[PDB]
Amino acid sequence: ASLTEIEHLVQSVCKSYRETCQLRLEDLLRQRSNIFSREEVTGYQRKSMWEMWERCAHHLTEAIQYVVEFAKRLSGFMELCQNDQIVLLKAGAMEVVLVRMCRAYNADNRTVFFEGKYGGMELFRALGCSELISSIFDFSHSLSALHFSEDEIALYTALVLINAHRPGLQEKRKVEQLQYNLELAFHHHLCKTHRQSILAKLPPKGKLRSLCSQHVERLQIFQHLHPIVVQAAFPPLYKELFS
């Protein structure tokens, strides 16, 4: 591995991310004054639990679709066997979305971009998932304090996905090798840009694992309350990944 090869991987990963980032950062930043009014917030809170769940599941599914495309364009991913591609996506797609979400989070007023405007965690009160919602908001707040560049998000999210420890992998060594190359690319880029200080401040794997576990648990609780709603009205991909 040359330095030119590693730099090539950095730019390839960054490009793959740019092409699949869903919303341009500038578009998210331009909308920060566009905040849901007290009336619109009350509107969301009066919506039924199942309608709010369906809406959130739809938007997560949209976000996940861009992550799948990211993976498909990610150097080395499509060279892995289909079993391992699926394993990595099933375990990592949601984690990637949770990291990407810090882009749409405003730390100054603790709001997140949702359905055209910015709203606080009170917006989601109809879900009955207060602990999950506040955890997601806390995680996004912690990521916002790092002030990720887009390139850093690209490299970091590539590693969130390419994790050789995921149970069910048939070609573990192959995933190990790609992971290591992406670690070099990420760490080289941080060295070159004098940003190695963030390494110690990145959240442990357990934080992301906790969020995904809570999500799955709150889904199970809801699916017991409204089984036909999930069957009839939830996106197919969402159920495949989380049911």
Partner: peptide, 8 residues
């Protein structure tokens, strides 16, 4: 099977 369709 949705993941499968998306990957190809």
């Amino acid at each position: 099977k949705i993941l499968h369709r998306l990957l190809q």
